[PDB]
Symmetry: T
Amino acid sequence: MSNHTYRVIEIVGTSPDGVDAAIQNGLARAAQTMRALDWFEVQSIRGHLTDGTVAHFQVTMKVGFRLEDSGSGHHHH
Amino acid sequence: MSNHTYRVIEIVGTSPDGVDAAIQNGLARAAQTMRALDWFEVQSIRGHLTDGTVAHFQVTMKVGFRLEDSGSGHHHH
Amino acid sequence: MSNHTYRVIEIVGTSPDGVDAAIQNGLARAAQTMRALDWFEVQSIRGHLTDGTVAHFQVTMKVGFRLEDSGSGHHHH
Amino acid sequence: MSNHTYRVIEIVGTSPDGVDAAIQNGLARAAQTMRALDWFEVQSIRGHLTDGTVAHFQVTMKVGFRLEDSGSGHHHH
Amino acid sequence: MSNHTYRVIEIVGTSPDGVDAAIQNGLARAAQTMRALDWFEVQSIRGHLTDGTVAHFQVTMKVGFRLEDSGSGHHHH
Amino acid sequence: MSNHTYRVIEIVGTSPDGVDAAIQNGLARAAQTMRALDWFEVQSIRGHLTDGTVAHFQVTMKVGFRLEDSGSGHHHH
Amino acid sequence: MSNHTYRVIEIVGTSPDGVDAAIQNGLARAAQTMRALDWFEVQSIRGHLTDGTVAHFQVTMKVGFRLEDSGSGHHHH
Amino acid sequence: MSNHTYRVIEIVGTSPDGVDAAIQNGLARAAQTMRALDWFEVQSIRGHLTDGTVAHFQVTMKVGFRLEDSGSGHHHH
Amino acid sequence: MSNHTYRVIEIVGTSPDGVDAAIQNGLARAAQTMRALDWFEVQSIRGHLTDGTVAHFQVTMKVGFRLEDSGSGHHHH
Amino acid sequence: MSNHTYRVIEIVGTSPDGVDAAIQNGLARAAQTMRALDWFEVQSIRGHLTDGTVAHFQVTMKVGFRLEDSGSGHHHH
Amino acid sequence: MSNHTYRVIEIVGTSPDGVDAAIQNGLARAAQTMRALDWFEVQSIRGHLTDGTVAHFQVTMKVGFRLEDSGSGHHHH
Amino acid sequence: MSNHTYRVIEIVGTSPDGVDAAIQNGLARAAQTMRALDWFEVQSIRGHLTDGTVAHFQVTMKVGFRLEDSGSGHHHH
């Protein structure tokens, strides 16, 4: 925890069944390929209405993962 | 799609059962009277607590609909 | 209060005598023609200076009114 | 200019040929039907890429027009 | 309603089951100890992912309650 | 002034007679019970319209007061 | 009006008697020395409380004035 | 369209000939190497002035592309 | 970690020797009296210049602490 | 480059022929009288519509120039 | 303190040795030529990396100074 | 410099010894693996307090690097 450095990527998750779906739907695919999803932050909740009655919630989130080598989980000052 | 122009209105949807409710509750009434709801954007999630334990989620959204005559769905450059 | 949906419009009120004037001057005209002004939110206080010494305060506000049919003032969850 | 009150609407103009196009393309249709477009403010410049190489610039703007009766263009304080 | 003054506090509610949970989970504890929760406003929806698949939604909200003595619910101008 | 630390609270003041009223109406009650109001910052000017013609300006402000013991009013670097 | 270019300066006006005072108090001194104050925009309304009961409203505004030579008031496209 | 998840990257495009150039200049290189640029959003228009008279417009944009496998273009609720 | 709810307070720390000082100077006093400072967020770095050459950095931060009873550090969904 | 200090001024450029015009029209006049325009940042794109069909794009930008004496272009740490 | 009016200028300070350096490096040059620097506000902390390992922190700040004649330090309402 | 296009990534640097540490700690690891870090922008300064007295400053920054082939450093308009 001395020089742990993280990276934040932004992904947009989409689900016709809610915001908690899109959050989980997108966060999930992200992990299918990335390392250590540690946190997320929602930046927008938007959406499209197809057929006028089918919303496809589109939630944009910023997700953060550790890139630095698993190193000493320490405090050094 | 050459000169399609849209209009954005802002509506606040309210539901005691969630944010996805208010979004759908309000978006829905909006369509009862407007043309071609194409998209929406959430701007705020607020709420009132009546009886101290009854939240009435109030979600404000900006909704967008086409005003321009259905015209050539085209690309011209 | 179960599915009450509101609409927010934005108007700019102007008065040479203050911000509370423009707020009331504009909000007032808005009601001359709209239904149930319930709330307002100020977004900007700007102004022009004519003759260099005559400010015309221009206050932009977002005003909200009920569109949904007067329905049950109720809580349903 | 004592109690002149204005209204601001938001429209999204779109053009495959630029931002100044979409601004003018949308502002123009707006006037086809509204009164006294006096000003505009850009809020976003976004866009879609169809065929991957055809951008359709979408510029969202807030446009303002006078609603109050043409009245004394005056200063009263 | 003449000199009613309110106070706004900020709390972060957390739930592994959604945003509407955290909102209600946190708002609720807040009332366990405070007076007259009247309104709330969401400011952020964030979260941590433990085990990589267990999100703990963290919603930050600003909650508002009346401090001024229950006084005349009146309008005085 | 070396380690003087302050605290900022947020209060909403309300008055049917203006924004300068609500600011003073709320700031005042705040002092009835707190120590050393030193500054304030307005964050929003909102309002409700009862009877459609009775605005109750609601101004939200952040107020700051000293918590640290009255200590040396000094500069140390 | 073809190449009229303006400059915006920021000034903070202060008055113990209100926001409309500080706006006018500051805007005024600004003109004592500058050319053609044409517009202003409020950016903050803050304040200090001396004696705990004497607010000195401090309003920060951005003021705009013409620098370009009085030239053709024209439209050229 | 049920679980389509997207990724947003941010790129800065630069052109001495305009903002629509930099937008297209940068968006273009981005596609030279990425999949399915679907949308873009401008976040800043900045620039450097070399030789004092050569602006190099620098437009920062957020571009979004699909990462999820081309899957059912469907609505499922 | 199922219903852990937190509270965020805002404090301004001040030090003539830097921003990391004010952050630590203020955060520290805050703990002298509060429970479980878990996190902080900087919102502003401002300052006053006394004697014209003595800056007193004033850093405003939002600090967050747990209020809910130490309860099961668990995940429940 | 050790103690190079810059100053940022804000100017509004205007042109009936576009945003890239106003940017260049205004930036240009600014240099007619200032030293070393090094960079610019757009803050707003607004405009007035005279005759309803003559937009006068008004672009506000923040421009930055060096004030410190041309000194060692160096790195010192 | 009745009609004291201030002016805010924006300067960018730069130092290879930190943010507190650039703040002091720039604020300092500003005073070499201006009157009564009373306060400052940081707006951005940016930077360039020359040689890839030499950061030149660039901190932009808004600095405020009194322009109005030293007048009665008084409260008048 | 005609079509140089850049990419901006966001990383969070962490150090128990300051903000200038985390900035340098994170920026550094980023370069260990990326090309041409040219600039950075701070977006947040946050932090965790372990043991209540060990802050781990977490600074989030946006870093920008060139992706386009080293090409003509030129101006072409």
